[PDB]
C-alpha cells in the first residue's frame, strides 16, 4: 500500500484518524455516563441484595462525578444531587410490603397506594414555595387572579367553531366509571409556558360545591359534549385528591402530590387495572 | 364602492397589493423575456 | 442496587401477560414475561448469528447471514442457504415485538403513556417492511437484507441502485428531510436546554421565558417546551414512517428509475411551455 | 394611527415626494445616458 | 405509480441486493416481436453482381436471394412506401435518392457488425428491423447536444447539466454523455485502482463522474437493466465482482462507438436538413436503438441466419481494442 | 381512551410577549408579534417578535445576495421562463467552475457566480453563527446552540470549501441546486469507491440514526411523562420531580441504564454534533488520504467476500 | 396621499421601499449582464 | 436633510450602511475579479 496517507506498510492516516475518534468517543461516553449519574446516585443496595445483609452504596462504572452547583435566580445555590430529596427518600417508611423477601420482588401496597404514594402514585420531594416567573409574578395561577389571560388562542375560532377551541369552564367532570364528580370552575395557567396546567373543579357531584380540587390538564379528556373525562381515577376518588395549602397558589411539591394521585389511578383506580390481560 | 374598507383591512390590503403586484410584474416581464418575439433586450426580428 | 428514589416505584402490576409470575427485577432490568421472551429471542438469534459466523468467518465486519435466493420464493430455505436468516428474522421480530410489549408494561407500572412503545413500533414497522412486507409484496424472502455489519451496506447500495438514482425517490427525499430535520431539532433542543441550565459561569439558571425569547430572537418563532418534544417525536416518527414508505414502493410499486417518476412533474399542463 | 400629526404627515409627504422626484430624476438621466450608449427597444428588424 | 405483481430475477449472490425487478405490464410485446422470416429462397443461377448494374454490396447473392432481401428490407425500414422509398420509378439502378445512398451504407454496416462484433451480439447479429422496427427512422436515435456560445460574463450557463433531459433519464446529469462515450472515446472509468490517492496519476473530476453516471443511466434504461445487472455497486470498479453482462456491454459501447464514428457520421453530408438535429448532425445510434428497453433485442430472436447477405466477412484488421482503448485504429479522422 | 398529549386541547392567550429585556446596547426587537391558533395546537402560539442586530442584518444581506445570484442564474439557465423555472425547479442549479480553473477565480459564467454565491452564503452562515452566539450571551445563556450550529457549518465548509481546496479545484464542490446537489452526493460516492466503506461516514450515520433514535426516545418519554409535567425540563433539572424520576426509571428498567433530565439533552446534543463532525472529517479524508474506500476496506479486512453466483466479467482492456 | 404616513410608520415604509429598490436594482443589473448587448463588463460589440 | 434622523434612527442607520456597503463592495470587487477585462490580478489584455 503506497501513496499519500500511508504511515507504515499497513497503517494509513484515515485508519489512525478513526482510532483517534474511538479514543475521543470512549472518553465522551464516559463523560456522558458520569453526567447520567448526577441524580439517584450512589445506588442504595438494600440488605436483601447482599450476602453481608447490610445496606450499601453502589457507585457503578463510571463512578458518579462531584456534586453540581446550580445558581438560582432568586439568590440561592442548590447542589445536585439535593441533600433533602435524598434524605427524604431514604427515611420515609413505605406503606408497602415486598411480595417476596428476595431483592427485585415488587412491593405490595398495604394501605391505599393512591394516597400513600406507591408506584405510579409516588411523588417526589420538591420545594413547597410556589414558583415565580422572571418578572416576579406567580408562575402557575388561576384565571381569576391572572386576568390578562383569556381562554382560546383565537377569538374567531373559539366563537364560530368552539369545538376545536374549547372553553372547558362550566363543563362536567366524569370519572373513569362515568361518575359525575363535579364541574370545572377555573383554569390554572403557567405564566412561563402560557399553557393550561390544571382544571379547578368543585366536588358537587361527590362532595360539596365549595370544595375546590385541581385536575391536571394532561389527565383530562376535554370532549366536544361539554364534558371532561378522567380515565385516571373514579369519580368518587376525586374526593381524596390532595388539596392546596393556599386556595390561589400551588407549589412544586403540591404539583407532584396532585399529578401523583391521578397517576395512581393508572393501576389502582378500579380493581383489575393492576391485573394482566391473561 | 368605498364600503370595501369596512370589510377588508385597508392597511394590510395595500401592503399585500404591492407585494402581489410586485410578484406579478416581475412574472410578466420575465415571461416576455423568455419569448423570442418580446425579449426587448435580445432584439430578435418581429 | 436501586436508585435512591426507585424504591417507591417498584410495585406490582401493570403487566400485559405473565402477571405475578414474571413481575420482578433483576438488577436494574425489569423482567416481565416479555423480558423472558425477548431474552430468549435475543440469545437464540445472536447464537444462531455466531454459528453462521463460525461457518463463514469470525471477522466482525465480514460476518453475514444472508437471506435465501429469490428462487426459493416464500418457502423456508435450508439452514445454510438462507434458512438460518429466516429463523433469525423471526427471532428478531419476536425480540423487537416483545421489547415494545415489555415497555408497555413498564409504562403502565409507572403511570406513563404508551408513547415510547408506539414510537418504537414505527421502527419495528420499518424493519418489518425491509424483511417481511417488501419481500412479501415482491414474493420472495431473498429481498430482505443480510444480517451483517458490512454485508447489509452492500445490500443497501445495490437496492438503491436498482432504481439507478435513489436520491430521486420522492418518499426517500421526504424521509431524509425528516432525518436531517430531527437532528437539527435535537441539536437545537439539546443545546437550548444545556444553554439555559448551564449558562455563562456566574449567572443563575435561566427560566422558560429565556428559552422562548432566545429562539424568537434568532428565527422569530419559538415552539415551546411542550411543542419541541411533540415536534421531535413527530420528525423522528415521520423519518421512520417515510423510510418504510420509500423502500416499500421501491420494486412493488415502482420498477423503473426513480428520476423517471418525476416525469409527471415535467408534463404538468400548467408549465409545459412546449 | 401613528403618532405623526397632520402637519407632521404633510411635511413628511412633501419631503418624500421631493426626494422621490430627485431619485427619479437621477434615474431618468441614467436612462438617457444608457439610451445614448445602446438603445433597448428594437425595431421590426431587431438590432 | 406501479403495482404488484412484478417480475424479479437475481443477479448477484443472495443478500447482495443485486436483482432485476421488472413490471410485465410495461412491456409492449409488439415492438420486440421479430418478423416472420421469408421462405428459404433458392440459391442458383448467376450472381446479382453481374445481372444488375449498380450493385456494390450484395454482389455474391443470387438473383432470387437478392429479391428476397429487397422485399424483406422494404418491410423492415419502409413498408408503407414500398420500392419507391430507395428506388426511383422504373430506374431501379439509379443511385439518386438520399435514402438509397444511406441504405447502401446501412447494408455495409449491417454486414460489418454481424461479422465482427460477436464479442457483443454473439450469434444473434442485427437486421434492418432491429433498429428500424418497421419505420423509416429508428425511434431510439439521438442528436448531439447543442453547444450554445457562452457569454463568460453572463448568467445561467448549464455546463451540459442541470436540466431534466430524456437523454439523462430525467436527471440533472450531463446531457452530452453520448458524444463523449458513444461518438468520442473519453475514458469512462472514475475509480482509482489504489487504496491511497495519487493525484498526479488519477484525479478524475466529479463532472466526469456524472458524465459517466449519465451514460450508465442510459445503458440501464435503454436495455431494461439497472446498475446491478452489470455491477455490484458496493464494489463498483471490480470486474470480478460484476456479472458477465458488464463484459458484454463493454463491447456494446465500442460497437456503438464504431457504428456512429465509422458508419453513421459519414452519412451527415448527404443527409437532408429535415433529418438533421439541432446542431446539424445525423441521428446516431444509442443502446436503445437496438434494445428498445430489452436486454435481448427482439427477445433475442436470431433472425440473421435466415438472411445471408446481411452477414459480411470477418475483417482481419478488427481488434475491438482500437476504438479509443489503447488505440484509435478503428476510428476515423 | 386517554389524552395522548399530541395536540393541545385547551389554549389560553395572554398579551404578546416582548421577551426578556436585553442589555441597553442591542437593537430593539421588531414590534410585530401575533398568535396563531394552529401553532398553539402543537406548541407555543406566538409568532414574533424577531431580533435584528448588526450580525443578523448583515447575514440577511449576504444571504439575499447568495440567493439572488443562485436564483438569477437558475432563471437565466431556463431562458428567463418562469414556467420552465417551475418545470425545471428541482433540476436547475448554479454550477461550480469546471476543473480547468483549479482554485483560481473563474469567469462569471464559468463558475464565477458559483464562487461568489458560495462566498456570500458562507459569510451569511458565519454571521448567523455570531448572531446565535450573541443572542445566547445577551440573554445570559450558554452558547451550546451556537456551537452546535458551528459543528453544522464545519460540514458545510468541509464539503464545499475545505475539501475542494485540499483537492486543488473548485470543480469538486457542490452545485447550488436540488437534484444537482443530489447528483454531486452520488457522484462523490461513485468517484471514491462506495462511501459506505468510509468509517467516518459509517460513524456519521451512527449519530444521524442515533439522533433520530434519541429524539424519538426522549420526545416520547417526555410526552409519556407529560401527565407529571415533564416538559417543564428546567424545573425538573433544578428540582427533580416525579416526572424526571419516572422517565429515568422507565429506561433503567428497560435497558439497565438511564440518563438524567439534564443529561439526556447532553446525549442528544453530542449525537447531533458528532453526526456532523464525523461527517466533515470523513469528507476531508477521502481524495486526500484515501482514493478508493472499498479498496481501503479490503485492505483493512472489512469488505465481505461473496461466493460465486455468476460468471465474473473480465476487463477487455486489462 | 399625505394621509398614507399617518397609516403606516414612515420608518417601516422607507425600509420596505429601500429594500425593494436594492433588490430590484441588483436583479436588473444582473439581467443586463446576462444579455450580450448590454453586458458592459463583457465589452461585447453590437 | 437633517430631519432624516428624527424618522430613521441614526445609530442603526450608520450600522446598516456600513454592513450594507461591505456586502456591496465585496460583491463588486468579486464580480470584477470574475471577468477577463477587469481582473487586475490576472492582468489579461484589455
Ligand atoms: C459507536 C457505535 C458502536 C458502539 C455502540 C455501543 C456498543 C453496543 C451497544 C451496547 C450498549 C449497552 C451495553 C450495556 C447495556 C446495559 C447493561 C447495564 O446494566 O449497564 C449498566 C452500566 C452502568 O451500571 P450502573 O447503573 O452504574 O450499575 C451500578 C451497579 O453495577 C449496580 O449493580 P446492580 O445491583 O445493578 O447489579 C445487577 C447484577 C445482579 O445480578 C443478580 O444478582 C441476578 C440474580 C438472579 C437470581 O446483574 C444484573 O442483575 C443484570 C444482569 C443482566 C440481567 C438481564 C435480565 C434479563 C431480563 C429481561 C431484560 C432483557 C434485556 O451502564 C452501561 O454500561 C451501558 C451504558 C453505556 C453505553 C450506552 C450506549 C452508548 C451508545 C453509543 C453509540
Ligand atoms: C407566520 C406569520 C403569519 C401568521 O402568523 O399568520 C397567522 C395565521 C392565522 O392565524 P390562526 O390563529 O392560525 O387562525 C386560526 C384559524 O386557522 C382560523 O383562521 P382564519 O379562518 O381566520 O384564516 C383564514 C385564512 C384565509 O385563507 C382563505 O381564505 C383561502 C385562501 C386559499 C384559497 O388564513 C390563512 O390562509 C392562513 C391559515 C391557514 C391554516 C391552514 C393552512 C393549510 O396562522 C398561521 O397561518 C400559521 C401557519 C403555520 C404553518
Ligand atoms: C477538527 C475537526 C472538528 C472541527 C469542529 C469545528 C467546530 C467545533 C464545534 C464542535 C463543538 C461542539 C461542542 C461545543 C460545546 O460543548 O459547547 C459548550 C461550551 C459553552 O460555553 P459557555 O456557554 O461559555 O459555558 C457555560 C458553562 O461553562 C457551562 O457549560 P457546560 O457545563 O455545558 O460545558 C461543560 C462541557 C465543556 O465542553 C467543551 O468544552 C467542549 C469540548 C471541546 C472539544 C470539542 C470536541 C469535539 C471536536 C471534535 C472531536 C473529535 C476529535 C477527533 C480528531 C480525530 C478524528 O463539559 C465537557 O467537557 C463536555 C465534553 C466532554 C468531552 C470528553 C472528551 C474526553 C477525551 C478523552 C480522550 C481519551 C484518549 O462551548 C465552549 O466551551 C467552547 C469551547 C470550544 C468548543 C470547540 C470549538
Ligand atoms: C450514493 C450516496 C452515498 C452517500 C454519499 C454522501 C456524501 C458525499 C456525503 C454524505 C454525507 C452523509 N451521509 Mg451519506 N451517502 C450514502 C448513503 C447514506 C445513507 C443510507 C441509509 O444509505 C444515510 C443515512 C446517509 C447519511 C449521511 C449522513 C450521516 C451524512 C450527512 C450528515 C448531514 O446531516 O448533512 C446535512 C447537513 C449539512 C450539509 C450541514 C448544514 C449546515 C449549513 C450551514 C446549512 C446552511 C443552510 C443555508 C443557510 C440555507 C440557505 C441556502 C440557500 C437557500 C442556497 N448516507 C451513499 C453511500 N453521503 C455527508 C457527510 O458528512 O459524509 C461523511 C456528505 O458530504
Ligand atoms: C423510528 C424512529 C427511530 C427509532 C426509534 C426508537 N428506537 C427504539 C425505541 C424508539 C422509540 C425504543 O424505545 C427502543 C429502545 O429501548 O431504545 C433504547 C429502540 C431501540 N432501537 C434500537 C436500535 C436501532 N434503532 C434504529 C432506528 C430508529 N429507532 C429510528 C431512526 C436503528 C437503525 C436505523 O439502524 C437501530 C440499530 C435499540 C437500541 C432499541 C431496541 C433494542 C431491542 O429491541 O433489543 C432487543 C434485544 C436484542 C439483543 C435484539 C436481538 C435481535 C435478534 C435476536 C438478533 C439480531 C437480528 C438483527 C436483524 C441483526 C442485524 C445486524 C446487521 C443489520 C448489522
Ligand atoms: C448538528 C447538525 C444539524 C444542524 C444544526 C443546526 N442548524 C442550525 C442551528 C443548529 C444548531 C442554528 O442555531 C441555526 C438556526 O437558526 O436554527 C434555527 C441553524 C440553521 N440551519 C439551517 C439550515 C439547515 N441545517 C441543516 C442541517 C443541520 N443543522 C444538521 C442536521 C440543513 C441541511 C440538512 O441541509 C439545512 C438546510 C438554517 C435554517 C439555520 C441557519 C440560518 C442562517 O444561516 O441564516 C443566514 C443564511 C441565509 C441564506 C440568509 C437567509 C435570508 C432570507 C432569505 C431573507 C428573506 C427576505 C426577507 C428578509 C424576509 C421578509 C420578507 C419581507 C417582504 C417582509
Ligand atoms: C430568480 O430568483 C429570484 C431572484 C426571484 C429568487 C429565487 C431564488 C431561488 C429560487 C433560489 C433557489 C436556491 C436553491 C434551490 C438552492 C439550493 C441549494 C442547495 C441544495 C445547496 C446544497 C449544497 C451546497 C453546498 C454545500 C455549497 C457549498 C459551497 C460552499 C461552502 C462555498 C464556499 C465558497 C467560499 C468560501 C468562497 C470563497 C471565495 C474566495 C475568496 C475564498 O475565493 C478566492
Ligand atoms: C442500427 C444500428 C441500424 C441498423 C442495423 C440499420 N439502421 Fe438504418 N438507420 C439507422 C439510424 C440511426 C438511422 C438514422 C435515423 C434518422 O433519424 O436519421 C438510419 C437511417 C436509415 C435510412 C434513412 C432513413 C431516412 O432518412 O429517411 C435508411 C433508408 C436506412 N436506415 C435503411 C436501413 C437498412 C435497409 C438497413 C438494413 C440493412 C438498416 N438501415 C440497418 C440505424 C440502423
Ligand atoms: C397483495 C400482493 O401480495 C403479493 O403479491 C405478489 C404478486 O401477486 C406475490 O408475488 C407472487 O407472484 C410473483 C410474480 O412476480 C412471484 O415472483 C412470487 O414468487 C409470488 O409470491 C406475493 O407473493 C404476494 O404476497
Ligand atoms: C404530493 C403528491 C404527489 C403525487 C405524485 C403522483 C405521481 C404519479 C405518477 C408516478 C406513479 O407514482
Ligand atoms: Fe427535553
Ligand atoms: Mg451535476
From TrEMBL, chains B, H:
Binding site for bacteriochlorophyll a 2: 29, 40
Listed GO biological process terms: photosynthesis, light reaction
Protein location: Cell membrane
Lipid bilayer topology: Single-pass type II membrane protein
Primary location: membrane
Binding residues for bacteriochlorophyll a 1: 10, 18
UniProt keyword annotations, A-Z: Antenna complex, Bacteriochlorophyll, Cell inner membrane, Cell membrane, Chlorophyll, Chromophore, Light-harvesting polypeptide, Magnesium, Membrane, Metal-binding, Transmembrane, Transmembrane helix
GO cellular component terms, semicolon-separated: organelle inner membrane; plasma membrane; plasma membrane light-harvesting complex
GO molecular function: bacteriochlorophyll binding; metal ion binding
Residue ranges constituting the Antenna complex alpha/beta subunit domain according to the UniProt record: 1-41
Residues passing through the membrane, by range: 12-32
Biological role stated in the UniProt entry: Antenna complexes are light-harvesting systems, which transfer the excitation energy to the reaction centers.
Full protein name: Antenna complex, alpha/beta subunit
Organism: Halorhodospira halophila (strain DSM 244 / SL1) (Ectothiorhodospira halophila (strain DSM 244 / SL1))
Residues of the full protein shown: 1 to 46 of 67
From TrEMBL, chain D:
Name of the protein described by the UniProt record: Antenna complex, alpha/beta subunit
Superkingdom assignment: Bacteria
Keyword Metal-binding: yes
General function of this protein: Antenna complexes are light-harvesting systems, which transfer the excitation energy to the reaction centers.
Subcellular localization(s) per the UniProt record: Cell inner membrane
Stated family: Belongs to the antenna complex beta subunit family.
Boundaries of the shown chain within the full protein: 7 to 53 of 75
Membrane topology, from the record: Single-pass type II membrane protein
Domain Antenna complex alpha/beta subunit: start-end pairs: 6-41
Transmembrane segments: 15-37
Biological process, per Gene Ontology: photosynthesis, light reaction
Any one GO molecular function term: bacteriochlorophyll binding
A GO CC term assigned to this protein in UniProt: plasma membrane
Alphabetically ordered keywords of this record: Antenna complex, Bacteriochlorophyll, Cell membrane, Chlorophyll, Chromophore, Light-harvesting polypeptide, Magnesium, Membrane, Metal-binding, Transmembrane, Transmembrane helix
Organism (species): Halorhodospira halophila (strain DSM 244 / SL1)
Annotated positions binding bacteriochlorophyll a: 31, 40
Coiled-coil residues: none
Automatic annotation (TrEMBL), chain F:
Record localization: Cellular chromatophore membrane; Endomembrane system
Pfam families membership: Photo_RC
One of the record's GO cellular component terms: plasma membrane light-harvesting complex
Membrane topology recorded in Swiss-Prot or TrEMBL: Multi-pass membrane protein
Gene designation: psbM
Transmembrane segments: 50-72, 113-133, 145-166, 200-225, 267-290
Binding partners and assembly: Reaction center is composed of four bacteriochlorophylls, two bacteriopheophytins, two ubiquinones, one iron, and highly hydrophobic polypeptide chains.
Function per UniProt: The reaction center is a membrane-bound complex that mediates the initial photochemical event in the electron transfer process of photosynthesis.
CDD domains: Photo-RC_M
One Gene Ontology term from the biological process aspect of the record: photosynthetic electron transport in photosystem II
Keyword annotations from UniProtKB, A to Z: Bacteriochlorophyll, Chlorophyll, Chromophore, Electron transport, Iron, Magnesium, Membrane, Metal-binding, Photosynthesis, Reaction center, Transmembrane, Transmembrane helix, Transport
Protein name in UniProt: Reaction center protein M chain
Chief location: membrane
Family: Belongs to the reaction center PufL/M/PsbA/D family.
Keyword Transmembrane: yes
GO function terms (MF aspect): bacteriochlorophyll binding; metal ion binding
Domain of life per record: Bacteria
PROSITE patterns given in the database record: REACTION_CENTER
TrEMBL record, chain G:
GO molecular function: bacteriochlorophyll binding; metal ion binding
Organism of derivation: Halorhodospira halophila (strain DSM 244 / SL1)
One GO CC term, this protein: plasma membrane
Residues of the full protein shown: 1 to 46 of 64
Record-annotated membrane-spanning stretches: 12-32
Key words, A-Z: Antenna complex, Bacteriochlorophyll, Cell inner membrane, Cell membrane, Chlorophyll, Chromophore, Light-harvesting polypeptide, Magnesium, Membrane, Metal-binding, Transmembrane, Transmembrane helix
Binding of bacteriochlorophyll a 1, residues: 9, 12
Localization (cell): Cell membrane
Membrane topology type: Single-pass type II membrane protein
BP terms from Gene Ontology: photosynthesis, light reaction
Identification of the protein by name: Antenna complex, alpha/beta subunit
Binding-site list for bacteriochlorophyll a 2: 29, 40
Domain of life: Bacteria
Amino acid at each position: 500500500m503506497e501513496g499519500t496517507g500511508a504511515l507504515t506498510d499497513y497503517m494509513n492516516v484515515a485508519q489512525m484518524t478513526l482510532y483517534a475518534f474511538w479514543l475521543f468517543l470512549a472518553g465522551l461516553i464516559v463523560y456522558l455516563r458520569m453526567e447520567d449519574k448526577r441524580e439517584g446516585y450512589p445506588l442504595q443496595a438494600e440488605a436483601n441484595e447482599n450476602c453481608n445483609r447490610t445496606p450499601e452504596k453502589k457507585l457503578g462504572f463510571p463512578a458518579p462525578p462531584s456534586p453540581k452547583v446550580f445558581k438560582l435566580a432568586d439568590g440561592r445555590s442548590i447542589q445536585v444531587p439535593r441533600a433533602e430529596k435524598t434524605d427524604y427518600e431514604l427515611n420515609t417508611q413505605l406503606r408497602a410490603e415486598p411480595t417476596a423477601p428476595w431483592d427485585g420482588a415488587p412491593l405490595e401496597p398495604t394501605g391505599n397506594p393512591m394516597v400513600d404514594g406507591l408506584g405510579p402514585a409516588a411523588w417526589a420531594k420538591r420545594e413547597d414555595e410556589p414558583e415565580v416567573t422572571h418578572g416576579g409574578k406567580q408562575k402557575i395561577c388561576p384565571l381569576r387572579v391572572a386576568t390578562e389571560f383569556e381562554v382560546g388562542m383565537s377569538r374567531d375560532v373559539a366563537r364560530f367553531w368552539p369545538e376545536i377551541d374549547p372553553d372547558p369552564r362550566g363543563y362536567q367532570v366524569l370519572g373513569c366509571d362515568g361518575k359525575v364528580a363535579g364541574k370545572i370552575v377555573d383554569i390554572w395557567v403557567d405564566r412561563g409556558e402560557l399553557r393550561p396546567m390544571y382544571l379547578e373543579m368543585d366536588l358537587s357531584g361527590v362532595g360539596s360545591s365549595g370544595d375546590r380540587v385541581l385536575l391536571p390538564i394532561n389527565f383530562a379528556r376535554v370532549g366536544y359534549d361539554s364534558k371532561v373525562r378522567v380515565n385516571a381515577i373514579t369519580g368518587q376518588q376525586f374526593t381524596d385528591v390532595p388539596r392546596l395549602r393556599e386556595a390561589d397558589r400551588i407549589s412544586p411539591q403540591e404539583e407532584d402530590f396532585i399529578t401523583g394521585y391521578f397517576g395512581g389511578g393508572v393501576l389502582y383506580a378500579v380493581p383489575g387495572r393492576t391485573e394482566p390481560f391473561l | 364602492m368605498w364600503r370595501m374598507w369596512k370589510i377588508l383591512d385597508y392597511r394590510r390590503t395595500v401592503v399585500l397589493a404591492h407585494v402581489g403586484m410586485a410578484v406579478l410584474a416581475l412574472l410578466i416581464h420575465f415571461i416576455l423575456l423568455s419569448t423570442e418575439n418580446f425579449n426587448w433586450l435580445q432584439g430578435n426580428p418581429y | 442496587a436501586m436508585l435512591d428514589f426507585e424504591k417507591k416505584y417498584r410495585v406490582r402490576g401493570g403487566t400485559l401477560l405473565g402477571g405475578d409470575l414474571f413481575d420482578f427485577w433483576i438488577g436494574p432490568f425489569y423482567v416481565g414475561i416479555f423480558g423472558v421472551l425477548t431474552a430468549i429471542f435475543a440469545v437464540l438469534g445472536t447464537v444462531l448469528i455466531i454459528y453462521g459466523a463460525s461457518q463463514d468467518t469470525f471477522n466482525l465486519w465480514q460476518i453475514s447471514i444472508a437471506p435465501p435466493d429469490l428462487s426459493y420464493g416464500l418457502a423456508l430455505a435450508p439452514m445454510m442457504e438462507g434458512g438460518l436468516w429466516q429463523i433469525i428474522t423471526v427471532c428478531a421480530l419476536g425480540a423487537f415485538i416483545t421489547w415494545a410489549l415489555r415497555q408497555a408494561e413498564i409504562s403502565k407500572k409507572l403511570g406513563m403513556g404508551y408513547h415510547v412503545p408506539v414510537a418504537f413500533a414505527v421502527a419495528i414497522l420499518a424493519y418489518a417492511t425491509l424483511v417481511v412486507f417488501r419481500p412479501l409484496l415482491m414474493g420472495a424472502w431473498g429481498h430482505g437484507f443480510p444480517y451483517g455489519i458490512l454485508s447489509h451496506l452492500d445490500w443497501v447500495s445495490n437496492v438503491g441502485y436498482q432504481y439507478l438514482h435513489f436520491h430521486y425517490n420522492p418518499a426517500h427525499m421526504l424521509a431524509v428531510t425528516f432525518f436531517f430535520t430531527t437532528t437539527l431539532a435535537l441539536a437545537l433542543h439539546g443545546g437550548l436546554i444545556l444553554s439555559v441550565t448551564n449558562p455563562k459561569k456566574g449567572e443563575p439558571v435561566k427560566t422558560a421565558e429565556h428559552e422562548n425569547t432566545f429562539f424568537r430572537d434568532v428565527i422569530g418563532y419559538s415552539i415551546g417546551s411542550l411543542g419541541i418534544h411533540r415536534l421531535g417525536l413527530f420528525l423522528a416518527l415521520n423519518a421512520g414512517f417515510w423510510s418504510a414508505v420509500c423502500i416499500i414502493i421501491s420494486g412493488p410499486f415502482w420498477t423503473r428509475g426513480w428520476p423517471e417518476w418525476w416525469n409527471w412533474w415535467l408534463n404538468v399542463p400548467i408549465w409545459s411551455w412546449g | 394611527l401613528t403618532g405623526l400629526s397632520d402637519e407632521e404627515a404633510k411635511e413628511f409627504h412633501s419631503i418624500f415626494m421631493q426626494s422621490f422626484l430627485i431619485f427619479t430624476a437621477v434615474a431618468v438621466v441614467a436612462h438617457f445616458l444608457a439610451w445614448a450608449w445602446r438603445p433597448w427597444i428594437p425595431g421590426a428588424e431587431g438590432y | 405509480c406501479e403495482r404488484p405483481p412484478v417480475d424479479t430475477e437475481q443477479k448477484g449472490y443472495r443478500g447482495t441486493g443485486m436483482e432485476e425487478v421488472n413490471n410485465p405490464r410495461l412491456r409492449d410485446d409488439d415492438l420486440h416481436l421479430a418478423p416472420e422470416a421469408a421462405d428459404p429462397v433458392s440459391a442458383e443461377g448467376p450472381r446479382a453482381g453481374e445481372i444488375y448494374q449498380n450493385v456494390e454490396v450484395l454482389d455474391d447473392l443470387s438473383v432470387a436471394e437478392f429479391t428476397r432481401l429487397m422485399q424483406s428490407m422494404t418491410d423492415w425500414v419502409s413498408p408503407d412506401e414500398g420500392c419507391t422509398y430507395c428506388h426511383d420509378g422504373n430506374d431501379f439502378a439509379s443511385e439518386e435518392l438520399y435514402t438509397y445512398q444511406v441504405s447502401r451504407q446501412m447494408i455495409e454496416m449491417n454486414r460489418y457488425v454481424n461479422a465482427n462484433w460477436d464479442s457483443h451480439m454473439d450469434d444473434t447479429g442485427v437486421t434492418c428491423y432491429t433498429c428500424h422496427r418497421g419505420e423509416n427512422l429508428p425511434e431510439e436515435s439521438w442528436f448531439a447536444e447543442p453547444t450554445p456560445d457562452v457569454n463568460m460574463a453572463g448568467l445561467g450557463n448549464t455546463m451540459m447539466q442541470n436540466l431534466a433531459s430524456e437523454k439523462t433519464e430525467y436527471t440533472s446529469l450531463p446531457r452530452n454523455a453520448f458524444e463523449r462515450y458513444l461518438l468520442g472515446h473519453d475514458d469512462l472509468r472514475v475509480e482509482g485502482d489504489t487504496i491511497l490517492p495519487h493525484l498526479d496519476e488519477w484525479d478524475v473530476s466529479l463532472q466526469d463522474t456524472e458524465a459517466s453516471y449519465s451514460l450508465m443511466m442510459h445503458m440501464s434504461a435503454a436495455t431494461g437493466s439497472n446498475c446491478t445487472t452489470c455491477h455490484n455497486t458496493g464494489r463498483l470498479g471490480q470486474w470480478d465482482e460484476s456479472p458477465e453482462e458488464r463484459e458484454i456491454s463493454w463491447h456494446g459501447i465500442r460497437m456503438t462507438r464504431d457504428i456512429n464514428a465509422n458508419w453513421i457520421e459519414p452519412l451527415e453530408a448527404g443527409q437532408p436538413e429535415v433529418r438533421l438535429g439541432p446542431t446539424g448532425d445525423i441521428a446516431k445510434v444509442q443502446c436503445a436503438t437496438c434494445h428498445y428497453g430489452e436486454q435481448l433485442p427482439l427477445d433475442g430472436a436470431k433472425m440473421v441466419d435466415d438472411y445471408p447477405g446481411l452477414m459480411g466477412e470477418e475483417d482481419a484488421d478488427f481488434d475491438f481494442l482500437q476504438f479509443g482503448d489503447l488505440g484509435t485504429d478503428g476510428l476515423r479522422d | 381512551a386517554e389524552y395522548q398529549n399530541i395536540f393541545t386541547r385547551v389554549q389560553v392567550r395572554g398579551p404578546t410577549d416582548p421577551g426578556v429585556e436585553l442589555p441597553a446596547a442591542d437593537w430593539p426587537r421588531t414590534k410585530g408579534a401575533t398568535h396563531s391558533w394552529l401553532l398553539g395546537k402543537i406548541g407555543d402560539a406566538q409568532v414574533g417578535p424577531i431580533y435584528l442586530g448588526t450580525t443578523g442584518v448583515m447575514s440577511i444581506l449576504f444571504g439575499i445576495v447568495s440567493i439572488v445570484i443562485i436564483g438569477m442564474n437558475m432563471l437565466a439557465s431556463v431562458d428567463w421562463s418562469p414556467l420552465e423555472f417551475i418545470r425545471q425547479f428541482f433540476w436547475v442549479a448554479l454550477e461550480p467552475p469546471p476543473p480547468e480553473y483549479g482554485l483560481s477565480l473563474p469567469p462569471l459564467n464559468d463558475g464565477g457566480w458559483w464562487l461568489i454565491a458560495g462566498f456570500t452564503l458562507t459569510l451569511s452562515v458565519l454571521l448567523w453563527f455570531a448572531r446565535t452566539y450573541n443572542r445566547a450571551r445577551a440573554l445570559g445563556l450558554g452558547t451550546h446552540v451556537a456551537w452546535a450550529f458551528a459543528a453544522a457549518i464545519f460540514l458545510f465548509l468541509a464539503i464545499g470549501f475545505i475539501w475542494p481546496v485540499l483537492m486543488g479545484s473548485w470543480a469538486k464542490s457542490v452545485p447550488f441546486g436540488i437534484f444537482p446537489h443530489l447528483d454531486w452526493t452520488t457522484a462523490f460516492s461513485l468517484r471514491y469507491g462506495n462511501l459506505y466503506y468510509n468509517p467516518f461516514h459509517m460513524l456519521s450515520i451512527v449519530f444521524l440514526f442515533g439522533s433520530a433514535l434519541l429524539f424519538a426516545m426522549h420526545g416520547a418519554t417526555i410526552l409519556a411523562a407529560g401527565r407529571y409535567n415533564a416538559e417543564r425540563e428546567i424545573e425538573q433539572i433544578t428540582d427533580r420531580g416525579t416526572a424526571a424520576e419516572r422517565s429515568a426509571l422507565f429506561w433503567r428498567w428497560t435497558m439497565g441504564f438511564n440518563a438524567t433530565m439534564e443529561s439526556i439533552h447532553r446525549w442528544g446534543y453530542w449525537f447531533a454534533i458528532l453526526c456532523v463532525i464525523t461527517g466533515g472529517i470523513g469528507i476531508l479524508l477521502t481524495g486526500t488520504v484515501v482514493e478508493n474506500w472499498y479498496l481501503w476496506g479490503v485492505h483493512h479486512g472489512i469488505a465481505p467476500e461473496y461466493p460465486e453466483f455468476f460468471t465474473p466479467a473480465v476487463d477487455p482492456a486489462a | 396621499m399625505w394621509r398614507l404616513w399617518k397609516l403606516y410608520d414612515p420608518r417601516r415604509v422607507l425600509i420596505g421601499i429601500f429594500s425593494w429598490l436594492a433588490v430590484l436594482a441588483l436583479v436588473i443589473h444582473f439581467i443586463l449582464l446576462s444579455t450580450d448587448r448590454f453586458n458592459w463588463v463583457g465589452g461585447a460589440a453590437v
